[model samples]
Target: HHHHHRNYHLFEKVRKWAYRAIRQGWPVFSQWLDAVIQRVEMYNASLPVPLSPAECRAIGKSIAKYTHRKFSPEGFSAVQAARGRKGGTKSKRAAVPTSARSLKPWEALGISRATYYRKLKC
Candidate 1:
């Protein structure tokens, strides 16, 4: 359905609300929100029909849902629970380097590199 010219600005307002949500540290990504806003702006600019307040509202409501998920202690715990599944301590073995092997067989025996390898062939 076509929108009122003033309602078009409400859609613009919806875009601003999503951006402010990002500035305030909502967990949703700026790239994702920017893409969403770009699409609606393009739709407004290029499409023959303008979007109604109802259509604008749906996008606005999405921002509300996205933010409501991150602003509370319950949401913080939800994020933690999701992260807990993937979390683990780094292996201690990785912290300690492997023991080095010395060239005692070749050097102590005064053997040349060529001879040491040749002896193994025999």
Candidate 2:
């Protein structure tokens, strides 16, 4: 359905680099990156949009290259998970979180809490 993952890995690497620019990011990244990654991934992947990962890299790279920030081809990641695989799903979707059930910060951020915690367990 899309480009080979060679470029996708670099794309995720570039995205990860963007997050490290945050303050105290030594820990802040773990606190925040994954959900944002999902948010961005879905955003990028949705509605058959323009600026493919390569194009985004081209323009964003120009900005970063001009500014000369620290960067790499492939570096580190908190954890990785397969997106949207169906080991199973309930006949009915789970109810939305109420006040008591609540949710993880990342759940509010973008990804489903179930997906976020699944990777954490691995």
Candidate 3:
């Protein structure tokens, strides 16, 4: 379970790069990814190696999973859908407006507020 979770975060990380590649080209994107990869590889200052295309394409795969465009075969493909996780409509709960017009539980049930409170306890 924990290992899968790690892969999930890695996928998301790669997707962000892919997303930017779609919006921007390598000239701009490379500089951007370089900063990140450098930061991550910072501990290995003894032998700093620049990110190669092979390494970059692996990251791009996350985006290809959704978009079909890929810099390399190891990258993502179009119509790629993430599986394993329970597929559900991913939407957020709307903020409840602070207003008297909104109905309370009792109001919706056509009952007294006190009764609603009592019912909740029972």
Candidate 4:
């Protein structure tokens, strides 16, 4: 309970300072606020009590077994089935363009000409 209480107080202080800085429109205040919050979280994780190696290994093994049991059979079957699906003629619909088409209205909104041409192929 003490650890939780300390974390709550730390979070409250961070929130107060972040909101104050935001209200004052300080430059890079949002970045500073994020760093502070991350530091608090790191401090919390660095508390004295940590998981033992055996406990960590058990957790890792349980997660791996559960994930493999859930996905292994279907994953293997999907890979096997995919081998037959790759023999079709490839469509040029998704092929990269050699030259840029005229920019669409949406393209002029925020997209750059370089980005548009970057998607093209010579």
Candidate 5:
């Protein structure tokens, strides 16, 4: 029961970590690997499952290498994407103007006219 609960908790953490990685550009694979390790360790300790430490270590190292390759900022694919070199230039729209005519009620109530226009230009 306790072991099952631990596994469940670790699984939840892994899911949350993956979600966060997707949303925030963090490393999902490392977080997933850690969760796998924790679950493996817990099960190994609790059950008669034949677990080899050496094999686990090798697997972890391989996972880390793969994750690094996939997520490294300097990796070729990432660099190409960051440099925006693949596709033709797309039109980038500027922010909406906040002049008196464009200003929302809350914005007009909160900010001075000069400050609003200055920010709009920016």
Candidate 6:
């Protein structure tokens, strides 16, 4: 059975601090926290079981530690410079050359160059 979705005013109070704290953080931090809030809100609203107060409290504390790390000079500078982001096997690959090669006909009237060559092999 499906029912019309009802907004819970009481839970909104609990969720309000998410946006409040987000507004006070760094821009990137706020964006990440925005995603966090959206995900949790969606999960909480859609499920029969809701996140407990203790679970919410732990999430707050966890992100607060992350905020502290993000605000520190060394930690902040590392992310700002993207030190770890551009390194490793990811960027080592050579860029693919997109220039297309031209092909000539194999002096065959029945088929094109690639088709004639491929059909001959088969």
- Top-scoring candidate (lDDT): 1
lDDT string for model 4 (1-122, tens) is: 23455545445544444433432433253454344445445444564764334433333334333333444445546766787467443533553455345335337656777765665675
TM-score of each: 0.31, 0.22, 0.25, 0.23, 0.28, 0.29
Candidates 1 and 2, the one with greater lDDT: 1
Give lDDT per model, in order.
0.56, 0.46, 0.47, 0.46, 0.51, 0.50
Give the per-residue lDDT of model 1 (tens digit) for 1-122.
Answer: 45567455656665565544544554455454554555455555555665654565466556555655445656557777778756744323343344223434667678776787788888
RMSD of each candidate?
Answer: 11.5, 21.8, 12.4, 19.4, 11.4, 13.0
Clashes of each: 0, 0, 5, 0, 0, 0
Candidate 1, lDDT over the whole model: 0.56
Candidate 4 is scored at a TM of: 0.23
The list of candidate 3 runs beyond 4 A from truth reads 26-62, 69-122
Total residue pair clashes for candidate 3: 5
> Which pairs clash inside model 4?
none
Please give the ranking of all candidate structures by TM-score, highest first, separated by commas. Answer: 1, 6, 5, 3, 4, 2
Identify the runs in model 6 with alpha carbons over 4 angstroms from their true place.
Answer: 1-43, 69-74, 83-122
Q: Quick one: how many clashes does candidate 4 have?
A: 0
Q: What residue pairs clash in candidate 2, if any at all?
A: none
Q: Which window of 10 residues has the lowest lDDT sum in candidate 6?
A: 1-10
Model 5, span 1-122: residue lDDT tens: 13455445444544443333433454466675664455445544664553456544444445444554565445545667866854536646665797545555546469776676676676
TM-score of 2: 0.22
**Between candidates 3 and 6, which one is better according to TM-score?**
6
In candidate 1, position 22 carries an lDDT of 47
Question: Per-residue lDDT for 41-102 in model 6, tens only?
Answer: 56566667666544544454455446534455555557757866666536676545652223
Question: What are the per-residue Cα lDDT tens digits for candidate 2 across 1-122?
Answer: 45545346545655655545432343233333443444445545553544465544443454344323333323322121222233234245666786424655766758776777776887
Ranking 5 against 6 by lDDT, winner: 5
